[PDB]
C-alpha cells in the first residue's frame, strides 16, 4: 500500500500468499479451509510452489512467532471467465483464533451505499525505502461507477489523499462495514495506476460472485 499507515495489530483475516518462498500478493480468509484471492496471483500451476501464511503482522513473520500458521495449497478453484477471482483450498485447515479469523462475505447482489468508509490491507509496494514488513492499510470511500470509467456489474468504485493498493497487495480484500458488520466487498486487482490521486481504484465486486463462492464451498470437499 502506498501512502497508507501501518496497522497497530495484525488483521485476522489477512493471508500472505507465498510464491516460491516469496510473498507475491494478498488474500483474505473466509472459511477455515478457503481463501479468496485474485487470478493474477498464480503464475504457476504446480501446487507445491505455494504456501499460505496466516496470523502474521510481519510479512516475514518476525514479530508474530507465537501466532503464524503456514498452510499448504491443496487446490485452486478458478472463478468464472472475467471474474479474476480464485478460491484457494488448503490442505490442512486453519486453526481459528484471535490472530487467525474469518471475514464475512456480503449478501448476493447488494449495492453498498456511496461514501461508505472502506479499507485495503496488504504487504505490497510502499513507494518508500525500508519497508518495515508490517501490514499496511489505506482508507477509501465507495464512489459512483461513472467516477471510475473515464463499468461491468462485477466491479465497484472506491477512492481516497492519493493512496491505495499497489503491486504486492493484489488478491487482498476491500473491507467495508455496514450495520456493524465488516464484510469483504471487493478484491484488489491491478488497476490502471498505483495510488494516483483523484483516480479511484477498480475492485472486482465480491457481492457479484458471492453466490458463486458458496457453490464452490458446498461442492469441493475438504479431507
Amino acid at each position: 500500500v502506498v501512502n497508507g499507515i501501518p496497522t497497530r495489530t495484525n488483521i485476522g483475516w489477512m493471508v500472505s500468499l507465498r510464491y516460491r518462498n516469496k510473498h507475491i500478493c494478498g488474500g483474505s480468509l473466509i472459511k477455515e479451509s478457503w481463501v479468496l484471492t485474485a487470478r493474477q496471483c498464480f503464475p504457476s500451476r504446480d501446487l507445491k510452489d505455494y504456501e499460505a501464511w496466516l496470523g502474521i503482522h510481519d510479512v516475514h513473520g518476525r514479530g508474530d512467532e507465537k501466532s503464524k500458521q503456514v498452510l499448504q495449497v491443496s487446490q485452486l478453484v478458478y472463478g468464472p471467465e472475467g471474474s479474476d477471482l480464485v478460491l484457494m483450498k488448503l490442505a490442512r485447515p486453519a486453526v481459528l483464533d484471535d490472530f487467525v479469523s474469518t471475514i464475512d462475505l456480503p449478501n448476493y447482489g447488494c449495492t453498498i451505499p456511496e461514501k461508505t468508509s472502506c479499507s485495503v490491507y496488504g504487504w505490497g509496494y510502499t513507494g518508500l525505502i525500508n519497508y518495515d514488513g508490517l501490514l499496511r492499510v489505506a482508507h477509501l470511500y465507495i464512489m459512483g461507477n461513472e467516477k471510475c470509467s473515464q463499468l461491468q456489474e462485477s466491479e465497484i468504485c472506491a477512492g481516497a489523499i492519493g493512496s491505495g493498493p499497489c503491486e504486492g497487495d493484489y488478491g487482498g480484500p476491500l473491507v467495508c462495514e455496514q450495520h456493524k458488520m465488516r464484510m469483504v466487498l471487493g478484491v484488489i486487482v491491478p488497476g490502471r495506476g498505483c495510488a494516483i490521486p483523484n483516480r479511484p481504484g477498480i475492485f472486482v465486486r465480491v457481492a457479484y460472485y458471492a453466490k458463486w463462492i458458496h457453490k464452490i464451498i458446498l461442492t469441493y470437499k475438504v479431507p
Binding site: 447488494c110 449495492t111 455496514q178 450495520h179 456493524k180 457481492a207
Partner: peptide, 7 residues
C-alpha cells in the same frame, strides 16, 4: 431495489 450487504 437497493439490497443490503450486511446480514
Amino acid at each position: 431495489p437497493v439490497i443490503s450487504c450486511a446480514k
